[PDB]
């Protein structure tokens, strides 16, 4: 079509943004960045639709041009910057630190974290290979390139990013029993431990995951993010609900008792 698209129709935007139909014709097209278009969250949605700090798109640009917003310890002024999973958003004017972790309903939760936890991040290792001059490097899920990793680190593992120097503190090998959040598919946002990894050469490997309520579901390996060394030991604070999916009848019962 003669070139890259630059617009996003409101109806064609990702459903987890939870945008309304009648507010306009178009939706914010996420910029190119560390995270994929379908799996990202532009900062205009976060500051206006989620936090409701800004009343409109003019105000979110005013906020970021005064250098208030930091992502992963660096000031960002791109209103459509594609923030994604495990990214840290810092607003020192409001003294708030956020981490983008999926909630069990499939959306990006408003998950506040402590300043101590905001000093690092996790990244899923996509590939390990040799660069120029024979220097090995690791590519994380957010496009980071870390040189000289621990030689035991392999793909599908999770590394702990120092997030100020970009180096690797330590890692978690991908194996049975590791704590996992699902980052894709209809089981998105659920948290459980690996029960069984089913290999299919030339196809898609499948992972069997057990919920804390001993509910079992299957999802693709590309949707698997290792977040802990064992059950009940996540390396970051989990959002409210702890990633356990309840049926609608259970949710209705819980809502009846709460109110």
């Amino acid at each position: 079509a003669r070139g890259p698209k630059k617009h996003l129709k409101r109806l064609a935007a990702p459903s987890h943004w939870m945008l309304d139909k009648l507010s306009g014709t178009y939706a914010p097209r996420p910029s190119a960045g560390p995270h994929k278009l379908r799996e990202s969250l532009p900062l205009v949605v976060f500051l206006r639709n989620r936090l409701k700090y800004a009343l409109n798109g003019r105000e979110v640009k005013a906020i970021m041009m005064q250098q208030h917003v930091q992502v992963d310890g660096k000031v960002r002024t791109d209103t459509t910057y594609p923030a994604g999973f495990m990214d840290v958003i810092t607003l020192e004017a409001t003294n708030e630190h956020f981490r983008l972790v999926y909630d069990v309903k499939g959306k990006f939760a408003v998950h506040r974290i402590s300043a101590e936890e905001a000093a690092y991040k996790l990244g899923k290792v996509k590939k390990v290979q040799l660069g120029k001059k024979g220097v090995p490097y690791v590519v994380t899920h957010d496009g980071r390139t870390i040189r000289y990793p621990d030689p035991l680190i392999r793909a599908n593992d999770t590394v702990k990013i120092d997030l100020a120097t970009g180096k690797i503190d330590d890692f978690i090998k991908f194996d049975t029993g590791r704590l996992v959040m699902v980052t894709g598919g209809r089981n998105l946002g659920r948290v459980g431990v690996i029960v069984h990894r089913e290999k299919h050469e030339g196809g898609f490997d499948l992972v069997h995951i057990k919920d804390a309520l001993e509910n079992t579901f299957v999802t693709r390996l590309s949707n698997v993010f290792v977040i802990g060394t064992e059950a009940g030991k996540p390396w970051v604070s989990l959002p409210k609900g702890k990633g356990i999916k309840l049926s609608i009848s259970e949710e209705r019962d819980r809502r009846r008792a709460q109110q």
């Binding site: 009343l55 003019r58 105000e59 005013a62």
Partner: protein, 67 residues
């Protein structure tokens, strides 16, 4: 009635982070006076037919019309 309200820490802060039309409502600013959109667009497209300074363009146009 139900509405929306903003209170700034100072008048200086308010004048910086407010839309122009609200300041005109409160008398803190004067409505900027500009020509209509048709006139601004027609003038922009008229200037597109001139390469260089307007003084050079009209002097050269004047020379052609020996009148």
């Amino acid at each position: 009635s139900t509405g929306f309200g903003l209170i700034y820490q100072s008048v200086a802060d308010a004048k910086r982070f407010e839309p122009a039309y609200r300041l005109v409502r409160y008398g803190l600013a004067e409505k900027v006076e500009k020509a209509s959109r048709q006139q601004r667009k027609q003038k922009k497209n008229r200037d597109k037919k001139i390469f260089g300074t307007q003084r050079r363009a009209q002097k050269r146009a004047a020379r052609r019309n020996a009148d």
